[PDB]
């Protein structure tokens, strides 16, 4: 886990924060005032987790299909996967970073991810359950 801690400390230096992974191997972040993201250390890779919207498990064919169609566009560009977390009734965006040898690459992946997150929230926010 030390190698992971050293890499995120470096990223932290670039961003201006003393970042580190917690006991959950997670690093929770907030962009602006409503974009929740987390960097997760997992074996040989890192996973970027992005909160999209709380969503009904019975939202209906029309909404599910739209989400699954968006998954095709996201996968075509390797931007991540929209996944449903059952009990939590939450739609998340998940993307693995398989190359951790370069700080610049990791930062670029993170910026593309948070921007993708914002774009998806703008499209899907109307389906969020109150």
């Amino acid at each position: 886990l030390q190698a992971h801690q050293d890499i995120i400390a470096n990223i932290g230096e670039k961003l201006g924060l003393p970042l580190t992974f917690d006991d959950n191997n997670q690093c929770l972040l907030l962009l602006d005032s409503d974009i929740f993201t987390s960097i997760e250390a997992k074996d040989d890779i890192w996973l970027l987790n992005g909160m999209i919207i709380p969503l009904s498990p019975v939202c209906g064919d029309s909404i599910w299909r739209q989400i699954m169609v968006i998954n095709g566009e996201l996968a075509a560009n390797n931007e991540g996967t929209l996944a449903y977390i059952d009990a939590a009734e939450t739609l998340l965006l998940i993307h693995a970073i398989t190359d951790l040898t370069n700080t610049y690459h990791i930062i670029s992946q993170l910026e593309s991810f948070v921007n993708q997150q914002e774009a998806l929230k703008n499209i899907l926010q109307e389906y969020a359950k109150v």
Binding site: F36, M51, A88, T90
Partner: protein, 102 residues
């Protein structure tokens, strides 16, 4: 333990590190911490934490074992392989329709 706001923006947005989160297993400890920290959307934020916690819950772990049970890690080098090249043409040209009808 506490949230730190970065002095300079990231991707044109204000970047904030919410700090280390308590062990996810202690559900009530996590909940209590989420309230004590300076975060506006306090409700969006545990929900996200609930989601991250469940990714490696019982159901998930068990579904992974089943998948690994269903997955037949067959050697790609031993599978029969053919490169498809004229199939769309054959369909458009009506040849497939012919064979299926005869």
């Amino acid at each position: 333990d506490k949230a730190y706001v970065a002095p300079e923006k990231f991707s044109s947005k204000v970047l904030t590190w919410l700090g280390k989160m308590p062990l996810f297993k202690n559900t009530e400890v996590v909940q209590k911490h989420t309230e004590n920290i300076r975060v506006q959307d306090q409700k969006i934020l545990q929900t996200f934490l609930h989601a991250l916690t469940e990714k490696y819950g019982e159901t998930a772990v068990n579904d992974a074992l089943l998948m690994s049970r269903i997955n037949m890690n067959k050697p790609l080098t031993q599978r029969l392989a053919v490169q498809i090249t004229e199939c769309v043409k054959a369909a458009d040209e009506g040849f497939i329709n012919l064979i299926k009808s005869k």
